[PDB]
Amino acid sequence: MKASRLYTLVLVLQPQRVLLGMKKRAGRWNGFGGKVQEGETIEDGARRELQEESGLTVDALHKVGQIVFEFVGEPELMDVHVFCTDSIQGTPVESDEMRPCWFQLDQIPFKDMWPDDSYWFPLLLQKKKFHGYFKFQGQDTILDYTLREVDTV
Template sequence: MADIDARSVARFVEDTAHAAMPHRLYTLIFPMDRPNGKVLLGMKKRGFGQGKLNGFGGKVEPSESVEQGAIRELAEESGLRATRVENCGLLLFYFEDNPVAMEVHVFMAHEYSGKPAETEEMRPEWFDIDNMPFSQMWADDKCWWPLARNGRSFVGRFWFKADQVTITRQALTPVDSLDFARNARNIS
């Protein structure tokens, strides 16, 4: 059984049983072009989530903070270099027959440099923030995207069947702040 990562914030939002589970830390970051009403998504070309449109992100390395992980993943998967990001959400995923929870810290990138470029892992494309391609995305995205799109912070918990498509249970809570996670999030 894996140890609980010190950067995990599960203890602030989960019941005792779920908080005691090992949590693997991930990031998800969405470059925003607010003046044009666009968000950059990437078509996942390989690995977990292959064939789905998503934000950019992945595992947080042991030597980096969650925010540093989000910025690194965006650069690796899209070629963009984020210079200003905002943490807007926390997603916790539980998959049937998997004893490790996914703890995903969601960010919006409001300032960045470079041009989106296809990588081995992702093919980036701009989409209208008011007309998201939810049919090509993870099933939970349509639940929390309206909050993120409107600048609201949130905590979401989603239980998936082993098929990684069917949500069997969910809890989504808008929150005034994610400050409870600030200290843990910046541990590196």
């Protein structure tokens, strides 16, 4: 089994809208996140990446899922820990890396999101917790995947 590298993903989910970020350099909407750094907890890495990529500062995040990504031709798995909060207290800010944008929950921009999001994002919206795994050939094609609802992440 391949080694895996720790990443975070953060979804700001309010009752009628969700915050996504357009990857500027790319072209898909995503939650905010990045690699976990040495010595920080996964949740603290998620808070840090939310601040760096979206400008939002939050004190706490709720873990809602974990997704492992395998890319054909790449040696490592991406082990993505997915977090969610409903509670913010500042405005998102656009950088040269991510442009944050709100979407109503009947307008989730799946056509411009990664293909795996079609499977797990509905579980997140239902307040279900999940474990997923997706194998990709390139950016567009899923060759294999698993997804399970769990009671504990």
